[PDB]
Design a protein that fits this description.
The structure is cut from a larger assembly and holds chains A (55 residues) and B (48 residues). Chain A is mainly α. Helix content of chain A is 49%, strand content 0%. Chain A has helices at residues 2-19, 36-44. Chain B is largely without helices or strands. Classes of the chains: A mainly alpha (55), B little secondary structure (48). The PDB classes it as viral protein.
Chain lengths: 55, 48
């Protein structure tokens, strides 16, 4: 009787250790500097055309 | 009638002016600038 639940937990905890890898799901995006000429062009321009963007 | 009567009158010539807008006139973006202050200071004159 006791050995049954002991083996049940024995396999179940290995199953849990396998399961746990799925939890963390972060997004990866990198940052890079503008080209110098393009940066100067963007800084110089006076009107923005489209108003705003959130991404 | 009113300004809208002109606004809607899109024509062939506009392919060069308002098709695919790159700027607007109605929202200025101001650029932040280096912090500074300015003052008038008298310098010493050497000589008569």
């Amino acid at each position: 009787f006791t050995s049954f639940v002991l083996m049940l937990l024995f396999t179940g905890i290995i199953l849990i250790a396998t399961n746990e890898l799925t939890y963390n799901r972060p997004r990866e995006i990198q940052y890079r500097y503008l080209p110098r000429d393009l940066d100067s062009f963007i800084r110089t321009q006076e009107m923005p055309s489209a108003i705003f963007s959130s991404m | 009638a009113g300004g809208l009567s002109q606004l809607v009158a899109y024509g062939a010539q506009d392919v060069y002016l308002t098709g695919n807008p790159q700027i607007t006139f109605f929202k200025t973006v101001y650029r932040r600038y280096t912090n500074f202050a300015i003052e008038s200071i008298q310098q010493t004159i050497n000589g008569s």
